[PDB]
Amino acid sequence: ALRNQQAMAANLQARQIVLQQSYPVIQQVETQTFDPANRSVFDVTPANVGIVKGFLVKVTAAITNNHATEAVALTDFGPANLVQRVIYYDPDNQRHTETSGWHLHFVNTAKQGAPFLSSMVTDSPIKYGDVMNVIDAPATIAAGATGELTMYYWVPLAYSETDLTGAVLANVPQSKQRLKLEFANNNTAFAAVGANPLEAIYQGAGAADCEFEEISYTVYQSYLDQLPVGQNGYILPLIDLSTLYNLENSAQAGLTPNVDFVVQYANLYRYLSTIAVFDNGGSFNAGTDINYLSQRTANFSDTRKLDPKTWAAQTRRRIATDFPKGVYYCDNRDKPIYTLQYGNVGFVVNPKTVNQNARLLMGYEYFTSRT
């Protein structure tokens, strides 16, 4: 009965005590510089200490355009595509997040409430601004030039700094975690004119002759040390630590003009957010190829059937700007989509135009029970 109500209360209290008694630490775990032509997949081994909240991954790169005459220009995702995929496994080898660099980056932005680690432009005469180039990439790389890029990704375990749901307790020696990073290479980073720019960093007539010179990464692990001890050992939020907070993405196809394309939510998960990217056969449009988007439950009842601009308006309230062309966001944080609470639910897109090889790339943020 009220056995869980007491469980919930115990969890929250334990969380509050851990946060107040422990001290946060962020420390470098590993750094490596390489040429992706040699190797692009790396398995980083996080340190086993206290409760792990997440990882901040710094990525830098140098790209050279050796085309004789043509330039290349940033794609809509640009440096967010420096990391193609990220996968994390905890000490019990349970997989948490497994998604694309672009999806992880869009969630980082959604959680910040503004473009992740960006520098806002203001009229201040004091010289604040893009001083440190935290996330940066040249808009174009001309024939014969070399550009430098910097990108950051936060790989979460814990939901936030104050909500430890999804965090990982790593104090078991001989049982390691694994943070796998799959980086871009010359094949994924450069798209020829007319090719699909989805996974690319630069696109243009000089693409065939573009090459990475090097990529470097530094992984910083954020955790809580000096865990509080009481009468039974460590005071720990048991629900928090046995819940997985994950990001995952998938691709759905089968769109036809003026027909509702419905992507069912894969039940049991508590979906906090949904990102839908309309890759219209390599074309990414600013809503003009869509009639409306919506979230619908078993009853054909729509809770937010909106035209594209109005849908975008809701997102502007969340991140103070629009996501790139063809990228749509839906916040369900306060009331996560959870089938079994109200029948099957689906994310809906009714397309106005559908090109060949059209598809919806879905990105989800969700909570689910461990084991």
- Residues 130-189 contacting a second copy, CB under 8 A: 130-137, 139, 149-150, 152, 170-176, 178
The letter for the amino acid at 331 is D
The answer to whether 79 and 135 are in contact (CB under 8 A) is yes
Query: Nearest-5° angle of CA 243, CA 248, CA 252?
Result: 140
Q: Do the Cβ atoms of 28 and 218 come closer than 8 Å?
A: yes
Residues 215-244 contacting a second copy, CB under 8 A: 216, 218, 220, 225-226
Which of 4-12, 46-54, 64-72, 235-243 is the region at the interface with a second copy (rule: CB under 8 A)?
A: 46-54
**Do 157 and 240 contact (CB within 8 A), yes or no?**
no
Angstrom distance (rounded) from CA 363 to CA 101: 11
Positions in 300-319 near a second copy (CB under 8 A): 300-310, 312-313, 316-317, 319
Residue number with CB closer to a second copy (140 or 209): 140
Among 11, 65, 109, 203, binds a second copy (CB under 8 A): 109
Using CB under 8 A, which of 53, 103, 105, 318 touches a second copy? 105
Shortest Cβ distance from residue 240 to a second copy (Å)? 19
C-beta of residue 17 within 8 angstroms of C-beta of residue 228: yes
Which of 122, 194, 231, 340 binds a second copy (CB under 8 A)? It is 122
Across-strand partners of 152? 58
Nearer to a second copy, 3 or 173 (CB): 173
Q: Print the binding letters for residues 336-355 with a second copy: x by CB under 8 A, - otherwise.
A: ------xxx---------x-
Q: Which amino acid is at 21?
A: Q
Residue 119, token pair as written in the block: 């520098």
Among 148, 163, 209, 322, binds a second copy (CB under 8 A): 322
Q: Single out the residue of 233, 343, 250, 249 nearest to residue 296, CA to CA.
A: 343
- Shorter beta-carbon distance to a second copy: residue 18 or 74: 74
Binding mask 249-278 toward a second copy (x if CB under 8 A, else -) reads: xxxxxxxxxxxxxx---x-x----------
User: At its nearest, how many Å lie between a second copy and the CB of residue 236?
Assistant: 14
- φ, ψ of residue 152 in degrees (nearest 5): -130, 140
Closest CA to 261 of 294, 287, 285: 294
